[PDB]
Amino acid sequence: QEDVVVTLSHQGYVKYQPLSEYEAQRRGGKGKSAARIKEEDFIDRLLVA
DNA sequence: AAAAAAAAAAAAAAAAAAAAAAAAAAAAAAAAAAAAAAAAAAAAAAAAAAAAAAAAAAAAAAAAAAAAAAAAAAAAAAAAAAAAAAAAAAAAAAAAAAAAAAAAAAAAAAAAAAAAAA
Hints:
The chain is mostly beta strands.
């Protein structure tokens, strides 16, 4: 269907795409949700919603 | 001269393949539109350049949203067990150039035969 989905591409080999509803609201001041996106000595570049 | 293996007799067991004819689909190989890409012309918006200017960082200082401290409480993520996906390492292989052995054409010359001359 059309459902809001996240996508991100990193340096090297990443085109991972999780669903948007897994992450919940937070108050600005805490952050650090620690998403689970394994990366071996590369750098993230892009996120899209 | 001893050993061993093929082949053939006849009732039994058990298999395999080539084509025709029409109509539909599925691979697989081509011309041919159609658009990127590239070479070589003229052409034209941007940087340069200069003078002239006035809009936002400094500075004084209050005060009001703040980030550390304290506390309680919820429970995301990390590391350890197992269980699947997916890719290099190494080894193997079927056609394929190289070599060697047998079939068909070749004439030189003669044995045997057929035929005829005087």
